[PDB]
Amino acid sequence: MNPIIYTTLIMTVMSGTMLVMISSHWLLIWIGFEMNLLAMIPVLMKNFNPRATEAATKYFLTQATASMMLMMAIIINLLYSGQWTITKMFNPVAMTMMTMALAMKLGLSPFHFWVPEVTQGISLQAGLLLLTWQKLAPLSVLCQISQSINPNLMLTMAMLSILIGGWGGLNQTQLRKIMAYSSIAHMGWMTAVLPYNTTMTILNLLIYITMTLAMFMLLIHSSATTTLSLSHTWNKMPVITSLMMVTLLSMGGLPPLSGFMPKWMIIQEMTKNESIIMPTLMAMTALLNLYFYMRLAYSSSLTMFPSTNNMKMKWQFEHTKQMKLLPTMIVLSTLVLPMTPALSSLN
Amino acid sequence: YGPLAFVLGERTTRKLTETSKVITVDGNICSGKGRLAREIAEKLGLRHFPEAGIHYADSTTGDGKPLDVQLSGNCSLEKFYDDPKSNDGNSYRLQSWLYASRLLQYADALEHLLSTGQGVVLERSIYSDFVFLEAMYRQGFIRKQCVEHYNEVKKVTACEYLPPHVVVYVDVPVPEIQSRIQKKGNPHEMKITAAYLQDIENAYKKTFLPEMSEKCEVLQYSAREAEDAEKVVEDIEYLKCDKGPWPDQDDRTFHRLRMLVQNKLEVLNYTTIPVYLPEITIGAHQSDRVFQKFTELPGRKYSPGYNEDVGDKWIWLK
C-alpha cells in the first residue's frame, strides 16, 4: 500500500468517525459507519496474509450485519415518529435493534466472538486502530441515545462482556487475543454506566484508550505477538518490560494506578442509583483480568525467562523508529489518579 | 529514508542502474572465492563485502573492533574443527550465528545498493549458508531438530529480501582443496574431513546451483578460469537475465525493502525465535551476566552518541 493511499484511508476512517460524532441526522451517522467500514477493510489487510484476509472478511460480515440492523432501526423510528434527528428513540423495538447493532459494532457480548479473531489476524498497529479508534463512534452514538436505551439490556450485555472478557483471557497465550478479551471486559465496564452517567463512560474510554495505546506501542517496540516472544524482551530492553508491568497493573485496576479511577467512579455512580449487586459483581469479575495480566507480567518482567544465543547480535543495534507519544501515554495510564477531580472538563 | 521521503518522491528505481547488482561468489572451503570477489568488485566498481564472520556485527557497530566471544557469538570455528560433535552444541550455535551475520550483511548490502545505487559483491550469502548446515547434519555434527530450527528461521527471514542477480561459483575439486588446506597450514583447518568438504560440494551443486539457476543465471568457473578475473567481469557484463525478481520489482517493493533493511533489529527479529533447542538456548542467569557485561563495554551503555565514556559531548543538549 502506497503511503499516500494509507494516509488517505486512515483519514477516511477518522472522517467517518467524525461524521458519526458531528452529524445530527441518522442517515449521515450511518454513512459515517459505512465509510469507516470501507476504509478500515483495506487497512486491516495492509500486510497480505491469509489470516489478514480471513480477519477482514469476518469483520466485514459482522459490521455489515450491524449496519443493516442499525438502518432498519432508523427506518422504523422514522416510520413511527417521522424524525431523522439523533434523539430519544420513539419505538421500543427500534431501540432494541439499535442497541443490538451498536453492541455488535462495539463487540459487546454476546457479539464478542469476532473481536479476538480479528485482533489476532491483523497486525499490532491495525489492532491498535481497531481496539482504540473504532470504539469511539458506537460509544458516541450510544451516549447520544442513552436515555432511550433500556437499562436492562445494556447492563446484561455489559455484565456478559465483563465475564467473557475475563474468562477468555485466562486461556490465551497470544498477546493480541489477550488484548482483545481485555478490550471486551473494559467495554463492558464502559457500557455499564451509559444508562446512569455518560461522562463516566467518556472517562473510562479515555483511560482505556491511553492504556491500550501504551500496551500496543510497547508490544510494537518489543515486536512480540506471543508470551514467549515477550519473555525474551528482558534480555534486550528491560525498561520496556518493566513499563509493561506497570501498565498491566494499571489495566487490572490496582490502586494507586490510573486504571483504578474509572472503576472507582463507575462504582460510585452505580451506587448512587441504588445499584449495589451489579457493581460488586463487576468488581469481583475484574479479578480474572487481573489474573491473566499478572501471569503476563510474571512472564515478561517479574521473572527472567530463558533467552537465545542470537540475541547477542541484537544487543549491538538500537531501535530505529521512535514512537513519540509512548512516554506520555505510559505516564497518563499509570500516574493520573491524583488528578481525578479533573473529570469535569470533559463533563 | 522514510515514508515521508517516498511521498515526496525519493524513488529507488532511478538510482539503480546496470552497475547496480548483487554478485555472490560462492565455493567450497579454500576455493579462492575471496580473490575473485575482490577482483570483480575492483574491476566492476562495486563495493566488496568480505565474507561474514562471527564478529561482522561487531565490525558494523560501535568501535568496529571484535568483541569478546562471550559477548558476541559464544561460538568458535576452531572448536568446531577440533571437536565437531561437542556436547556444548557449539556447532549449531556457530551455524545459526553465521546465518544471522550473513542475513545482516545481506541487509547492509541491499541498503547500500538501494541508497547509493552502487553494486555489491558478497562472498557467499544467506542463500548459500545451508550448504554447511547440510554437511554438518550428514556428518552427524548437528541434530535434525537444529536443521528444522534453521529451516524455520530461514523461511521466516530469507523470503523478505531479494535474491542476487549474479551467482558466481568457483569450483575446486575436493582433493585439491585438501592439499590447499595443508599448504595454508592452519592447524584447526587441517582437521577438516574429506567427507565434510564433499558434502559441502554436494549441497552446492545438487541444491544451491539448480535453485539459483532457476531464478537467474549462474556463472560456474574452474579454479584456472576463476584466476582470469577480467574474463569473469566480461562474462558478467554480457549477461542478460531478464527473467528473475529484480525486473519485476517496482518502487513500492523497493520502498518496503529499504525500510526493512534500514531497521537492523527488524532484519534480525526472527533470528531470536522462541524455539528452545538446547544448543542455542541460554539460561536466565548466564544471559543476565552476559548482558550486564555487554552493557559495561565502553560505548555500549547508552544509545550511540550519548556515551560520555567514549568521548561524546553535549549530551545535555543532544
Binding site: 497465550t173 519473555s231 512472564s299 521473572t303 527472567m304 525467562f305 530463558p306 | 528452545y276 539460561g283 542467569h285
Partner: peptide
C-alpha cells in the same frame, strides 16, 4: 544458591 528463574520446561507451558 541463587534465586530460581524460569527453566525451559516452565517456559514451554506458556
Amino acid at each position: 544458591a541463587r534465586q530460581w528463574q524460569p527453566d525451559v520446561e516452565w517456559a514451554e507451558q506458556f
